[PDB]
Structure 1
Amino acid sequence: MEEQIVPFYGKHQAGITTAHQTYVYFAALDVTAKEKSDIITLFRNWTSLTQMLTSRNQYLPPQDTGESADLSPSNLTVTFGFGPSFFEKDGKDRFGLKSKKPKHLAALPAMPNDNLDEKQGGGDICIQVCADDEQVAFHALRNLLNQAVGTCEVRFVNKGFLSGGKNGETPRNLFGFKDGTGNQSTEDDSLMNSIVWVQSGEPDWMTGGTYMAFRKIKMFLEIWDRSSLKDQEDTFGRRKSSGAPFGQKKETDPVKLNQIPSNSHVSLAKSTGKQILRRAFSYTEGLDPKTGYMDAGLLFISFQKNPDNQFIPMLKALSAKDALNEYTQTIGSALYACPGGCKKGEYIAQRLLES
């Protein structure tokens, strides 16, 4: 194989329109330090380390933890984002960043379907670590988090997986359906600018950036597995094996809305007329300690340049009447502003944090 490296420095952060890797570690952190200088050091230390990750005194602790020494970089990417709590917490503006706060960075509105665990969402800082090998992804996250002890406390850490098809087929979620068809092509720069990338109207540090929505969505695999193929397909409006819209021959044929249930998932999301870039991963977390049922679902991640215009209307349309709600439950939620890309020589979020 060729080198499995994704460029870290550029106009954009990697991990967004980068091709979807197989594994993710997703962590949220809260800043406990009270001085912006500590955060500056964090982000320049994170930048140098991430550049190393993505590319003699025995009485001292090893600088690196060592468990990816013999492994390929496996298309490792690290994406950083800022939560609303980074800018304002407990009624006070932090670190003097009011002038630089993004337009659309607020917590997502409360939906009635939600069973949100506050500790499973939010966070001042998110770190999305993706690679085609789970040990590589964990190694990257662990070394990054090792730098933040002293400055931050980790809020939560999730991990997930999503295997694309052997022949390049659209990857399937835990319900067995191709997941990602409705995305536009990430190699179409024009469409990514219109959907994902902030181009103007925001602070300089957010230009070339995007907003990341995070929803941890439990999936009721047991009752889904007892449901008929027809019910499963009716839930989505696509046929399970082909991923083709109802009444169509191929996965990539256009959805015909008059042929699918109006409460189906695809119909409702298509109804808004809005677009986002989904980049989710499945998770399994053993058995629910309470119910003794399998804990599994979707780490739903999507990017959009304007979440108020593109993402909240989807939540509203789905939270109302989505057939998928029978089989899912949102238990975690967060929104993060992902900075524009980093130039070599500079550090992540330098335009935001620097005086």
Structure 2
Amino acid sequence: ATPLTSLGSEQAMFHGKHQPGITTPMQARGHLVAFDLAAGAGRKEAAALLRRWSDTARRLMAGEPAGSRDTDVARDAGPSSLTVTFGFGHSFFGRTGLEKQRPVALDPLPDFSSDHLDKNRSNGDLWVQIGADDALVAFHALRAIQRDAGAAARVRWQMNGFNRSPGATAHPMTARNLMGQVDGTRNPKPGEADFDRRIFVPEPPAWMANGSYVVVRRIRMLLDDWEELSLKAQEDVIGRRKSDGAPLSGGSGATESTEMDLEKTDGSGELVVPINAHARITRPDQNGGAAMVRRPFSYHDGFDADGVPDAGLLFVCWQADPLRGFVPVQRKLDRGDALSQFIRHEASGLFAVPGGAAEGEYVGQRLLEG
């Protein structure tokens, strides 16, 4: 039996080959933040900031108070699966005399025809992902990281999200999103032969060894439109059942794990999984092997004057190279996906997330020490 107390007592590793928050299980609470370096902050100031942040992250992920006078907001709680993950934006390198170390992988994402990006709420020099299963643990961490930045960097944008909690279901199962879909069934996962090739920069720029590239997209769901559709219409947009996430090509004994049949046709000769269904056209085998790990949070930030919900998905994906992951898939989806009609990409960021800190190190040390 899994005890209730495991929610708090579960602890993620800070030190490791890879940073936490990539293969870590889904967390109930998320805070994404971007910071811009202050005028006059260069390499040396940036290195000091990453040391402060890494010292803080190490402490908080072990359920210990912050290095400087802790607020007590997380006191009483266990680590609650807190993770803190750090990335660097294209713009960071030009602020710190590190242009020669800027990866080609940080070249700007395309201007997709369906983009509706608030550029002020996009991009940024530095990115931090905080997640935990307790909201006080998570907020405490956000606040400590943000306070560590002080005058050295300002908050450029900051978004809040959530997911299903541990124990909400009778047994662990794939999460849902605010469209009601089963979301998370098909991802690359650790132990697959090609997982590292797909997701992480290998050990043989050198500072990104064992790192990954994240693309963040704030995707509003057009729930007012979506929720007027029939079930058949909604399932045809994805190619999978809302009940259990099974492919539409499955019968009654099909489950979430049943393999999709992309050739199956009904009695009229029409494909059972539609030609433009999201879960057809996003597959690696439909994109020359293009692949990513998806690890999102859902969001809801209110209603506008007409009752339209500011709700959707904080889409967060991980890949060794955006040109073999997010970019080619999104080029296809832009106009090609049945889902595009029902969503709006409203903010974006692409960040280089290095390998995990070893004992005594700070995240990004190889970059900033050189």
Which residue matches 2:65?
A: none
| Secondary structure at 1:135 match in 2 | helix
Match for residue 336 of structure 2 among 318, 321, 328 = 321
Cα distance in 2, alignment partners of residues 83 and 19 from structure 1? 25
Instruction: Measure how far apart 1:277 and its partner are.
Output: 0.2
Q: TM-score, normalised by structure 2?
A: 0.89
1:156-193 CA deviation, whole Å, 9 max, x = no partner?
A: 110111116621110000011111111122x3264430
Which residue matches 2:187?
A: 183
Which residue matches 1:221?
A: 223
1:268-318 CA deviation, whole Å, 9 max, x = no partner?
A: 2122142110001110001135x4311100000000001112221101010
Change (3 A) 1:67 1:340: same
Quick one: which amino acid aligns to residue 275 of structure 2? S
Which residue matches 1:168?
A: 172
Which residue matches 1:143?
A: 144
Q: TM-score, normalised by structure 1?
A: 0.92
1:42-100 CA deviation, whole Å, 9 max, x = no partner?
A: 11111111110000xxxxxx711221111221100001001101113xxxxx3221232
Contact map agreement 1:80 1:338 (CA 8 A) in 2:
yes
Cα distance in 2, alignment partners of residues 298 and 106 from structure 1? 24
Quick one: which amino acid aligns to residue 317 of structure 1? K
Which residue matches 2:50?
A: 43
Which residue matches 2:211?
A: 209
Q: Tell me which moved more, 263-272 or 125-134.
A: 263-272
Match for residue 16 of structure 2 among 10, 24, 34 = 10
Which residue matches 1:269?
A: 282
* Structure 2 alignment gaps of length 5 or more: 63-67, 264-271
Which residue matches 1:107?
A: 108
Which residue matches 1:351?
A: 366
Percent identity over paired residues: 40
Backbone CA RMSD of aligned residues: 1.5
Cα distance in 1, alignment partners of residues 192 and 141 from structure 2? 28
What is the correspondence of 1:1-355 to structure 2 with a 5 Å cutoff?
A: 1-2=5-6, 3-32=9-38, 33-55=40-62, 63-88=69-94, 94-163=95-164, 166=169, 167-185=171-189, 187-188=190-191, 190-200=193-203, 203-248=205-250, 249-258=254-263, 259-270=272-283, 271-272=286-287, 273-289=289-305, 291-355=306-370
* Structure 1 alignment gaps of length 5 or more: 56-61, 89-93
Quick one: which amino acid aligns to residue 134 of structure 2? D
Instruction: Measure how far apart 1:35 and its partner are.
Output: 2.3
Cα distance in 1, alignment partners of residues 92 and 42 from structure 2? 12
Cα distance in 2, alignment partners of residues 184 and 37 from structure 1? 38
| Secondary structure at 1:226 match in 2 | coil
Quick one: which amino acid aligns to residue 301 of structure 1? V
Cα distance in 1, alignment partners of residues 262 and 203 from structure 2? 34
Instruction: Measure how far apart 1:239 and its partner are.
Output: 0.6
Cα distance in 2, alignment partners of residues 177 and 205 from structure 1? 38
Cα distance in 1, alignment partners of residues 26 and 206 from structure 2? 27
